[PDB]
């Protein structure tokens, strides 16, 4: 059987698209839940909006992880490539993508609750940030795995 069949690029394209799709769904949900919390509470306390906006920024970063992996995978696509490269950069796509989705759900829920509560207990804001960092790195772990796999996609490959 050939090492480089004609359908090999397919798993590359799916991996490339999957990296940004799932990551965007995570960032979208994190933005939505946080946005409702901010708008609900800042009606009575407008002076602290630009402090409470952090969860939206934190969710926004996750989309950037998907973008860079998607771009790095994209520039490795070619017409003739080993099937091994296809599977590897499919795995790179899924690992960051569905890790971003997981981190997105986490930021959305604690971001909403933290903002909702902080408006009547000023000491709680530092707690919200501290928890959000633990949620944030769940995306970062996905990125590290994706970049390790991607680096391995094209070295010592014969075709």
């Amino acid at each position, epitope marked *: 059987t*050939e*090492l*480089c069949p004609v359908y090999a690029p397919f798993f590359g394209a799916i991996g490339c698209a999957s990296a940004i799709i799932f990551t965007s769904l995570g960032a979208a949900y994190g933005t939505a839940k946080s946005g409702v919390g901010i708008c609900a509470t800042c009606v009575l306390r407008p002076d602290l909006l630009f402090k409470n906006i952090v969860p939206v920024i934190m969710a926004g970063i996750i989309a950037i992880y998907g973008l860079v992996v998607s771009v790095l995978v994209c520039y*490795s696509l*070619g017409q*003739k*490539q*080993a099937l091994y*490269t296809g599977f590897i950069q499919l795995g790179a796509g899924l690992s960051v993508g569905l890790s971003g989705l997981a981190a997105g759900f986490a930021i959305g829920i604690v971001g909403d609750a933290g903002v909702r509560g902080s408006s009547q207990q000023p000491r709680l804001f530092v707690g919200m940030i501290l928890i959000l960092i633990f949620a944030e790195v769940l995306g970062l772990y996905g990125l590290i795995v994706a970049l390790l796999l991607n680096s391995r996609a*094209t070295q*010592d*490959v*014969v*075709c």
Partner: nanobody
Amino acid sequence: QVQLQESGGGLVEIGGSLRLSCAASGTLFTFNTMAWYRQAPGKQREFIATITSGGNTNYADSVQGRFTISRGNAKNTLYLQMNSLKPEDTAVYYCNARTMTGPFDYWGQGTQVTV
């Protein structure tokens, strides 16, 4: 695009020696097979030597013994070391890179060597 270029062309004394070099860039894989071809003026191309990704070699009897083909350490690089030249060696030389299947067969522009 994938592209190749040779190097090391020139002119030398009879019985002398020199090294030809070739490389490729922009590729996503190690070529299964790479080879050298020779064209003296007024004649068709001659097969000189070839070497697989694993180092398996084959030569034409016209260069057997006199020439040594070798892989470089960087992916998709060749060095051809030719010694004990004779005037009949005057030719342009090309390096060729080939995939195991499909139309993906590449050729450089070639370079000149003379006595």
